[PDB]
Design a binder for this molecule. Structure first.
Ligand SMILES: [La+3]
Length: 17
């Protein structure tokens, strides 16, 4: 995954792919 706001947790739109 790629964390799009960079907080150290994958959630929301980050999990999409
Ligand atoms: La995040």
């Amino acid at each position: 995954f790629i964390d799009t706001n960079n907080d150290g947790w994958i959630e929301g739109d980050e999990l999409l792919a």
